Amino acid sequence: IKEDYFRVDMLLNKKGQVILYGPPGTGKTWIARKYVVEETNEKTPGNKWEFITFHQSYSYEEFIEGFRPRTDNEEKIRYVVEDGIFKKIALRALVKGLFELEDATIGKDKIHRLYILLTKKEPLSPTEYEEYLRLKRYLWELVGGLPKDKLKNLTPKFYLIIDEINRGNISKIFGELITLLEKDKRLGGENQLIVRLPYSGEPFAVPPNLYIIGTMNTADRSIALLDVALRRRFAFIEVEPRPEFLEKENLKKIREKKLKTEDRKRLNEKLNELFSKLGNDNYFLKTLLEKINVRITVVKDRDHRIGHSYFLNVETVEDLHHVWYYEVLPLLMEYFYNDWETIKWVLNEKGKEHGNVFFEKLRLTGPNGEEAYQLKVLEGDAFIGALKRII
Amino acid sequence: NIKEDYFRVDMLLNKKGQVILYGPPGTGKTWIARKYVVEETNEKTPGNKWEFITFHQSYSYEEFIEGFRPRTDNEEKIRYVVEDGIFKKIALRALVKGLFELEDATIGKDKIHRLYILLTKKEPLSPTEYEEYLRLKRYLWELVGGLPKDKLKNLTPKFYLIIDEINRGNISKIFGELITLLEKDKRLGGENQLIVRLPYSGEPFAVPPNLYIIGTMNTADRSIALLDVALRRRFAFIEVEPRPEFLEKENLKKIREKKLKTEDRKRLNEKLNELFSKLGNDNYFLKTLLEKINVRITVVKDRDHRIGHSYFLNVETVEDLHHVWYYEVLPLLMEYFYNDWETIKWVLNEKGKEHGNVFFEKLRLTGPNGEEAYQLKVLEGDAFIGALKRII
Amino acid sequence: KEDYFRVDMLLNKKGQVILYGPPGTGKTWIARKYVVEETNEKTPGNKWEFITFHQSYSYEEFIEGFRPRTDNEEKIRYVVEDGIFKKIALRALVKGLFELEDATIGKDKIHRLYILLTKKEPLSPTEYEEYLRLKRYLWELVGGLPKDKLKNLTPKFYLIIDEINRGNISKIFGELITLLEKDKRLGGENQLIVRLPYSGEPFAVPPNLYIIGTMNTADRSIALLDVALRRRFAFIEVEPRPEFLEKENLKKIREKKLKTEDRKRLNEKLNELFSKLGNDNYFLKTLLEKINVRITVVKDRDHRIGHSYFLNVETVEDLHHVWYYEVLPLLMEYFYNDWETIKWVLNEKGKEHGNVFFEKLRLTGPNGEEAYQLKVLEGDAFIGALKRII
Amino acid sequence: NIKEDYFRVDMLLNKKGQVILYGPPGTGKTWIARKYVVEETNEKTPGNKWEFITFHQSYSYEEFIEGFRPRTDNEEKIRYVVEDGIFKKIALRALVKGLFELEDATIGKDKIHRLYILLTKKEPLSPTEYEEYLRLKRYLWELVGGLPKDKLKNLTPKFYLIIDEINRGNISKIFGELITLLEKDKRLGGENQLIVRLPYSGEPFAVPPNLYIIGTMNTADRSIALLDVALRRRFAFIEVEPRPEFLEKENLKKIREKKLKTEDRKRLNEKLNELFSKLGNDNYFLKTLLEKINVRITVVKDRDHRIGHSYFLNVETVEDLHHVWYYEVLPLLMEYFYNDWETIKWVLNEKGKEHGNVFFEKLRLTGPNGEEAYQLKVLEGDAFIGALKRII
């Protein structure tokens, strides 16, 4: 329950930036969204946290800093360097941390003027952008004249929760950030680094508030974080597809969490009607996902396992039929495209050819002695007898 | 029409949010995506309620949701502005049309109507009103941050985005932000409302629950197939198998007179009666012909390279069956088995035959190292049906 | 002086050093502590500057490039902006010439150039144009200086470039790949002043600049393969030393950067750690050394686990979080889906059940394949699965 | 041994026109290029008789021959002029100096000397007299286009352009339509005299026959002989091989005392004799060390992957030989053979030994599949020379 919540909370103070890696279909973004919401009490992104997600077009110029045309005057288009998503957070997490200090950072009129120009949603007019660029030069003249004891403990914890960190070209997006994402290379650490940015030339350093909880999938091995110098920075939490949630009681505890006892009585009798058709056993979908994830571990890899986001939203046996033939059996066929004696073994129907089998055998044969099976759409109670044979 | 391929799309798209109709070419995938949306939204053309786009390899992430696109102003010709793509112009359209019947936007119902005009405006946005468009966009994502999740579960329109040949583009790159939004409990109003932050404009963005995405990928090709396992969870794949049951005598009269409801039903029926009477009065001929080829293709080729039922659907006469055979599916069969003659003779069930009423005659000249290849024969008349009766 | 005896003696010999080594080793730390202890600057700025390279770091923003600059109301006057390197190379040369007086007439003119190089604000067009004239006066002055007075300049400047193998190292050092050598510095045996492309100005590296690269050499296909780059830079292999993971060495490291009162609590936490490890003060040393030998013999010598993973441990639970969330996903990333090796790296080649990180799944594949699963251990049973490595 | 390479460069200069000093790194092929130009042209500084240019991938056509630059004109009148690069400025300067001492070009010789001062002007040109530079250039090419090919076969001031790292830069981008001019048959004075116009400014251009392009080129990155098809036919290639004759005690004393020939050169002799007394009794130790490691490189990898003689050229004591060996060449030898311990041991020819004063001690562990990998060992003192003695 709170174990994955506490495990994120421990590693985000030790290493600084956690990564929830796992097979797709488990609670990676969910346990990352529930962590930042329950720690910052802010249900929508804004000042205290910002959700982004990476892709191949999420380059360096729009993440940290780059040139961006902006004039706000319908004339005299001013080619100025604008800060990306990260530098608008790390400068915000710094100047929010420079409020609670007593007398070390003597900027109490000039720091709050910089914070109100960093959280301003309306884009910056040039008569106030020259104030923002001048106060930011004051900030890195201020930071550097502060002791490390009055800079390590900055109070408000900021989070840049990112998603699909492996999907973007992570060594290119992280530019100057490739040497700043340790816990002791930030501000306030034992070895602080006021590193210099290329484009604007103004120096930069991450504050100790900003934590980067970044979820990724590791079934695509084409794009996995194999740089061995961006696995030292991050702390990698294993989020395995846990079939413990697909019980009768654990599915009743999860799916009846936010219903206010109105449709909960409808949900209770619907799950009572689902498991009465599976054989009066409370432990069906637990060992169904277990006997598939074990049988897909020994064949493909540990990482291509079926998650528990597929079967978690079933209500009746019809909804299990529409999540079997339309979400996971097309997924199981594209692991093993025209590899038929293997996909027959994942459903352990290897001796079973005809009858209540998902892949019935074609009565034809080949000229060179080959054969291929055909998918059989089953319905009714014969579908469950074709499914209970997996267990 | 409403029996299987309509009622299993509408049930699954309302449950998962996104549907991919994967299947071999020649099957009603683009058609069942087009028929379902037009019969739902009651708008036979794109525009307001739904948008039909298609993917390709020249398709950009910058032209899908958000990118820097240089526009042409009057006095400054090279002006680089950030322009929303087609998905951000249908996700914002599905949001501000659904937000006409809400009760927490009571300060800016005129501002939501003004934002809906700027999104329905097919004219290019002048820079005097583009800042009015950007001020209303950042007002919108301030308004849904103060909207409860109980009121964003039911938005009364139903907007659709039929993307066609989804698998052709770089779907991991086109769906940049959409690889974590496209889920039923990760849109607005769901159990996990996620408002991600876009790169270029810096404005937050979240797919509304009003939207639905009906992809129709093709799975005959394999280098463009959708193997992204983190993306196959977002969608809900519906295999539309090529059904030969749409090629019987009663089924061809029921499929071709439903659309053409003119006075030529007496003309089509006497022509379809004459076509099957030349086929030996076999009402299940073309059903058996497509079935005994798709099974014989499944066993030697992949199961997703099968002949669809869109080739033999538009047949009218034996002369029209001769045109759809020698020019559409027989060059297709010579493309599947390209100089593999022992297979393509077997698929047409002419394996022992090498002379006479046959599609591929054997050449009477062998090669130097023992190789031997065959030759097409343009058949006609009742000898052509005698070469088709050997398949079934 | 245990590792500056190599670094400070190779800078006076060659001019620049690349501290290459597998990650988790003090390559950035040695390169930062050496520069800070010599220039007496705890922060960058005047006497040194920290940058790093990446794939989107190009030639125009490093040394010299074109850049539009509209100040308040003027048209877009395309100024040429000097990159990071020329704002260190000119700054080392002008601070070099400011201390001596042989023929450098105009010490107020050289001081006027030094103020216009440490400007935090961007230069106004009434001040940039006089900055362009004084830079032309600088190279006309240096071109009439003897080599005996330019071979030594006391303010040793430093440009530390972390991750030097990331950026396109031939595209970055464009006019700099035949200037960084000690023989071709501004005052060496062959004083070579090359002409820069964009601004047209002459430019040569002054003999103050020491380019302290720290290349990560974990992954291949981005390392310095070109041998012209392997000659200007005198490399230093910084091996991951597990000698910093004994009891008396780890206690001496973490007390060096700590206070007086918390040092007793830090010493008590390290006594509690090695009392739970079986009174073995040589445990984390032989843990890292007998897992770096197994990585050396199978994969290669440059994918070894560093000594920055285990350096920040304070209890058995802190070793547990390092072992399961920092080096076991690292070990499963080296040998992905290759289970017969990763059992042997932990020398659990025969152990398949019990106190082992990888239990065996009970059934094999259809054609003789068998996979494992990462078992989470806790407590003294975890130590019993860790002390069998050594 | 330096005059033997000056006679080889001067032979292949007047025959071909331009030269590539290609060789493995650690050779003096930039220093041979730099000292031959200084010795022949009698100009120690890179200006007004020769020019140094380094190529890279960011080097373009606009800064090499000519492009457009803004100037310091009037305040509201910023102008884009055609500022010439380095190759156009050096070929004009070779043509202006060639016609300055010509007898038949005496029509405007008082103006050609005015054009020479503008080309040796070591600053950006003033806008009040840039049109004087433009009109004198337009006067010049009008005069050379009205002169025969008899008086242009040779010009006595021989200019040079030392191009360093010529394989780094993309030679097709910076030589747009002007790579054909470099041949002696197509220069300004051959029978195929080709005065090509330039794509900017409308100015004609043709390189004079005295401008020589002495290129230096690494050939150990990837290039062997087939990487440079756009310049492999125009340029004469000279293998500047690593000579280990410069590591003898008689040669090392003469090289370092060539520049520092003051009283401290005596202090070098008592320092160099201290080195060659710790290497045994011989003076041929560093020569045989480089020869018996360069033979063991050219027998495994390639000829031009060879260790040059510039690493060992700056040693004075055993400590500096310790710094050259463990930090510059053995971290260079480990990257020649990345994780192949059966042959990097054999380059140091200690293949029988596994430990005991070897640079690569063997780990006591074996492998599962049979892999055995060694480990670098730092040696110091008389043990290191005992490990260097077994190489020779």
Ligand SMILES: Nc1nc2c(ncn2[C@@H]2O[C@H](COP(=O)(O)OP(=O)(O)OP(O)(O)=S)[C@@H](O)[C@H]2O)c(=O)[nH]1
């Ligand atoms: N209550 C509860 N819900 C869970 C849990 N795990 C997954 N879910 C539900 O499953 C759904 C999908 O999980 P999600 O986090 O989105 O997968 P994902 O890892 O992000 O998928 P991916 O493509 O990025 S790899 C979420 O809506 C979440 O509510 C869990 O442990 N507890």
Ligand SMILES: Nc1nc2c(ncn2[C@@H]2O[C@H](COP(=O)(O)OP(=O)(O)OP(O)(O)=S)[C@@H](O)[C@H]2O)c(=O)[nH]1
């Ligand atoms: N009435 C009716 N027509 C059908 C049916 N299935 C296919 N068709 C016909 O097939 C024709 C084309 O099929 P279509 O859906 O467009 O193939 P497709 O999905 O585009 O094939 P692909 O190249 O993208 S892979 C249409 O003219 C349509 O009328 C059906 O079930 N009923």
Ligand SMILES: Nc1nc2c(ncn2[C@@H]2O[C@H](COP(=O)(O)OP(=O)(O)OP(O)(O)=S)[C@@H](O)[C@H]2O)c(=O)[nH]1
């Ligand atoms: N006291 C002390 N600390 C060290 C030593 N070596 C490493 N460390 C610590 O380990 C941490 C990480 O070392 P660091 O230098 O940053 O690795 P790195 O070279 O940057 O790693 P990478 O960038 O190649 S991935 C540093 O913060 C430093 O405090 C050492 O020798 N002595």
Ligand SMILES: Nc1nc2c(ncn2[C@@H]2O[C@H](COP(=O)(O)OP(=O)(O)OP(O)(O)=S)[C@@H](O)[C@H]2O)c(=O)[nH]1
């Ligand atoms: N006196 C003398 N010095 C030499 C000789 N060969 C090399 N050197 C010295 O060795 C140094 C290296 O030579 P250099 O020409 O700079 O290499 P390079 O061609 O630039 O190497 P690269 O750029 O291809 S990687 C020079 O500084 C020069 O002083 C020689 O034959 N005689």
Ligand SMILES: [Mg+2]
């Ligand atoms: Mg996610």
Ligand SMILES: [Mg+2]
């Ligand atoms: Mg289609």
Ligand SMILES: [Mg+2]
């Ligand atoms: Mg580093």
Ligand SMILES: [Mg+2]
């Ligand atoms: Mg050179």
